[PDB]
Every structure is written in C-alpha cells, then in structure tokens.
C-alpha cells in the first residue's frame, strides 16, 4: 500500500505563493496513477483543487484556475502544487490524493480516490504567530473535573496531553474557537476521582509548534 | 451538484443508507472524516470498491444519477461525517457531508464551573468556564447569570464530537469578562437545561 | 485431429437508416455505432436485444461538432471509450470523448490534442481494444499517408494514449518498408489480438480501379517501434475481404468476385464455409461489407447488410483441438 507525505504548508502572506510537495512511497508504477490535490477550508467541506493524469493531463478547479500548477516527477514519486496570488479563500488543509490502479472515467473525477495524505495546513494571513497562555481550571462528590485553558494563540494547531500522555481516559480537548481578537482559545478537561486530588499530580502539556512554545502547567486545587 | 442529507441517525445494529444525488459521472466514492481536523478515509471508491481494512459492513451502490452508501449493522464508532465524491462537467465535485448520529438512551450532563485563575486575573481578563460532561442528545442550553442577571453575547460554546465508545457529547461554555467587570460582581452561575435533567441545574461560585 | 465447426444464421432489423455500421461486443452483448444522415446527423449507440437493434443514445446530440466526425471506439473489459474527432484543417485536433462502464449511460467532455502528430495523415473510423506494450496499455489512433512519390521512409503513424484517451502524447512508430509509390491507401485500421499489432487496409489499383485489401503483421522490436510486413492471403478467383483470428489461427473472408454474390470463410486456410445470401429468399443481395466481430478465442460473428435495414448475422464456433 502507498504512503502520501505532504509538506510546504504554514503561514503565508496574502498575494504570495505556495509550494506544496507530496513524497509518495511504496508505489509500483507511480507514473500510471492519476494524482490529485483536494483542500478543505476551516469548518467547510472538501473541495477539489487539481488533477494530473498518467499522461500529464492537468485540470483545475474553478477557484484556482490561472493561479495553480500541478506537476509530477515520476522518477521520485512526487506530486507538487504551486499556487500563486494567495487569498483568504485559499486557507485550509491541503491533501494529496490518488485514484485506484484502474483509474476512472475522468482524471478530474473525485469518486475513485482510494488513498489520501495526512494533509498540510495552509494559512493565508497577514497576522503574526503567537504562542498561547496556559491557565489552570482548578477543581473546586465522587468524581472531580480539572483542566487548562489554552488562551490567545495563532495559528492552529495546539496539542494538549495530560501527564506526558500517561493520562488519556476521561480527557476531553475541545475544538479551538476563533475569538473577536483574531486569536484562538481552547480548553482541555479531564474527569478524575476526587480522592486522587491530593495523591496524584496533574499536569497539562501544551505544545504549539508554529511558535516553538511548550508549556507544562500543573493543575492543583486552590 | 452533489446533494446529500446533512444528518442521518441510527441505533447500533440498524442498517443505515446515505444517498448522494447529482453529477454526470460513472462513479461515486465515499470518504469518512471523524473530526474536522482528521484527514479523510476512503470507505468506498469506484461505486462499490472497498479499500483494505474497511469493514465488510460498508457497501456501495449506484443507480443512475444516485450513489448509496450502506452501513449494515451500525456501531458506536461509525459516528462521523460522510462525504460523497463524483464528477461534473465543472471538474471533481463533493457533497456537503452527512453526519451520522449514533442513537443511545438519554444521559444527563455532569455540570462543573471554573473560576478565573489568579494568573489570568493579572492580565486584565477573566474567563469563567462551565463544563457539561458526557450527555445525550446534543441539544443543551447554557444560561450564564452574573449576580442574577442574564448574560448575553459574551460567551462562546465548543462541543466535542460524539463519543466513539459511549456516543455522548461534552460541551464547554466560556464567559469572558474584563477584570474590572469581574471585580464588581459577587455571584457567577451557569444554568444548564438538558432533556435528561428533570429541572435546570445551576452551578456557581462566589468571588471577584 | 479434432475439428468442430458450428454456424447459425440470425437476422436483425434496424429502424434507423445507417450510413456506416460499426460493431462491437460488450459483456457478450452485440452493439452497433450507427451513423445516420432534409434531416439531421446522428451517431446512435444501439444494442441487439432479440431480433432488433435498440437505440440507446445519440452521442452526436451531446457534441457541438459539425458534419461527419471520425469515430474511434475502444472496448476494454468493463469500460467503453468513444471518440468523435472533427474532420478537415487546424494545428491541433479537437475531439469529444464519451465513457461508459455499462451499455447504457455515457458521460462526455470535449478534449483537444495540441500539435497532434497525425497532421495531413488520412484517418478513418474504427473499433479497437487496448494494446499492451511492455506493461502499459495504449489506445491507438492511426493514420496513413494518402499517396507518395519520393521514398525515404513515416508512411503509417500512430498516436497513442495510456491514460484512457484523455491525452494522446505517445507516438508509436510503424516501419512498413513495402509501402508503394504512386498508389493511394484507403481504410486503415489496426487489428489487435493478445499484444500483437497488425493492420488491415485498402490500396487503390492503377492498372484497374478496384480497391484491394492488404493485411500486414507487425513484430515489436524496440520499445514503441514496430516493424511490419505484408501477409499473403491471395487466393485465385476470390477477392480478399476481412481478416480475424480464432484459436491463434487466421479466419479469412473472401468474395467470389468484386460483386460479392458469395462469401467464403477459411479457417487456417484448411477448412471453409460458403455463405450464399440466398437465405430469406432475397434474390438481389450480396455480402459486400461483411466483417468479423470477434467474441472469444472460439466464437466470432460475420455480419453484413444484404439489403437496406436487413442485417445478416452468422454466428461461428470453431475449435481445432
């Protein structure tokens, strides 16, 4: 089975250009598969971006024609997307996709895709990166709830673990919300036994790769 | 233009069908997305073909300008958004996504209230959180009241996706006040109204 | 030896006045691509249901093409791809492609082959199947030089597609060194069977006026370059008509003379069957235009239109085990 690994995303300036790469692995005759790019804006559905047939036939979605160039290098099993004159509608996660061996009616069809990449986040924004502030949500009748508020960061995503991954049961990390300030806020909570509050240390491990920030916040009752 | 229903509900064990109509294509494909972050996973492609490690309970069909995904014997983990894909004269088209809701018995939420942390207060902002733990169904109303005054337009909610083991939701309502606003009041409360609660539950604290 | 030959005659009536017929087998169903012509042009896809053809759809309606286009149909196992290409004088060639996975629903879109290799070559409509050339399947569109006066050799040329007819960037080289100077070639079409490529075409006589069938076999030497050579099927007092293969042996059709009062079918030049179109009681009728429609290593049809609307279908079974 194939592996699709995308790179090239991140924060981009409006009007600038984007260069995505997808390094395929485990292919047998990569040269004979239709390869595609599909994007998904935040909170929206999937949207077809571009396709390249086994014979080089390129086709582009209406929202990107004239700005995008999809290409492939059969010797290295790579697929590339170049997208210039970036705008806010171009923000989203971009996925590398592949059609089955038998292919289908049209190279640009999206009902034959049998393999997807992990995706890469693309953020077309003139705002700058900001690491988060981590505040405890201190437990104040059998089961207790504690957590931590990950406040005012940009851009997405943030990752929250508890006790360096040793605590997973009962954890609820909420989806981030975009505030009026243009920054994100997320809360991560965990339900534990009230009896454990004195004997067990609870720490939330917040990692924000865009700003290279790592915060370990101990959550204790006040 | 692929048209698919926004939602579909089924009890575990039931057989559910999701139809997608539209497009001028020979083939339909079904892609599952568990969370809005998650990369899609092909369940069915080329009308009926099923990729490896996809359970046999997922079936694909095509009847004219219509494609049908059939889940025979639904499970709690089948909760997700199902996207349908096809072709048009305008290029590759996708459906808006159908959300599969696994039905279960009613569950009342477990309400918790968190006062602003002392570190946060130094920054001139106060965030008060109201947690609603493990309930069913999704429809729950959180009312914030500061010194018995209904708060409006200063709170945001966030709901987790339906659980893959116990089909329950968890919601979090955060009320944001300035440090000056939080300092001039005494009582802060969130009043939860859920179907599983015989009467609205109020949780509160007293400071600032 | 053990020879088994079995033939039967069935008739088919067509409600549509076909100008040129094009037969193909799909999922052991017989299909026709009828070209109709004070009225409008049509390109009907028909299917033999019982003893009648049934119009399934009109592909011409779906394209903004003018006049008569060339038609290249390709039948893979589960998919049918049909191409309607405009007939001349531009730098690139515009064509309209149709796809189906069943006999019924065809989906289309217009494609363009820019700076196509077959500029000023003569093309003619035909049905074909994918040709495997070193672990890759290609669809072929082949053309011929109308006439020649300087020999250097280039005479036959194929542009090919390994992406189901979306793009036609591949070029297949055909070295046919026996191409004659001072004669015109007419209805070239590739006959493909088990990765082996061959060509059936006509040559226009100068001493007389009648067109003559020629059939050449090609061997693959270098990747994408084939070398062809004429295959002698001459038979005294009989004119060569169509060529096909069953059992890895040739099945060849012949007419008595250029009027096709009768048709003989030879199996490996060893056994023969006579087809006299006197069946039905239709006196003024022949087998002009009789062609083979292969359906298996042991079965093939031999179809011709004895009269306007009447289709004579000879179902043939042959086994030399």
Residue numbers in the entry:
A (entry chain B): 20 to 159, 165 to 246
B (entry chain C): 23 to 230
C (entry chain A): 31 to 67, 72 to 122, 127 to 191, 194 to 361
Could you give the paper's own sentences about this structure?
The leading vaccine candidates for a P. falciparum blood-stage malaria vaccine are members of a heterotrimeric complex containing reticulocyte-binding protein homolog 5 (RH5), cysteine-rich protective antigen (CyRPA), and RH5-interacting protein (RIPR), collectively called the “RCR complex”. Each member of this complex is highly conserved, essential for erythrocyte invasion, and capable of inducing cross-strain neutralizing antibodies. The leading blood-stage malaria vaccine candidate, CyRPA, is essential for invasion of Plasmodium falciparum into human erythrocytes.
To identify the epitopes for growth-inhibitory monoclonal antibodies, we next crystallized complexes of CyRPA bound to the Fab fragments of Cy.003, Cy.004, and Cy. Synergy due to an allosteric mechanism was ruled out since structural studies show that binding by Cy.003, Cy.004, and Cy.007 caused no conformational changes in CyRPA. In contrast, synergy was observed when Cy.003, Cy.004, Cy.007, and Cy.009 were used in combination. In the presence of 1 mM CaCl2, the kd of Cy.003 was reduced from 5.1×10−3s−1 for CyRPA alone to 5.7×10−4s−1 in the presence of Cy.004 and to 2.7×10−4s−1 in the presence of Cy.009. To confirm this observation, the most potent combination of two mAbs, Cy.003 and Cy.009, was prepared in a 1:1 ratio and compared with Cy.009 alone at equal concentrations.
